[PDB]
Amino acid sequence: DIPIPDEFELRESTMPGAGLGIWTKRKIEIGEKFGPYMGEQRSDLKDSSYGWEILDEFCNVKFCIDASQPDVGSWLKYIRFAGCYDQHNLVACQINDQIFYRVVADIAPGEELLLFMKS
């Protein structure tokens, strides 16, 4: 399987219909980063699925990182997306052509890790 760190728990997300999410047992402070997001390098994400675009100088796609398939990826693939404004505690950022998730609000023990809502 895809291993989940001991400091996190994989269990039912509070996002309706999202399935299993990632929950912390430790306090997580603003400014911590997680990753890199892992997966197969692809030209695009036709199946939106689980994945991120990596961008060049000009904000155009250099390539994409796709974790569609169940055996590929890291525990970050299970972090779900907030549904509301300021419901999230993570944002993606890009460093050396890899995606990391940056903590933007404090996460107390027993709370779900949630990315910035989709458009």
Per domain, the residue ranges of the chain are 1-119
Collapsed DSSP state (helix, strand, coil) of residue 78: helix
Question: Which has the closest alpha carbon to 39: 81, 79, 91, 76?
Answer: 76
**Spatial separation of the C-alpha atoms in residues 69 and 102, rounded to whole Å:** 24
107: its two tokens = 């996460």
Resolution (A): 1.9
Encoding tokens for residue 68? 């569609």
* Angstrom distance (rounded) from CA 27 to CA 16: 24
At 75, give phi and psi (nearest 5°). Answer: -55, -20
Method: X-ray
Phi, psi of 78 (to 5 degrees): -90, -5
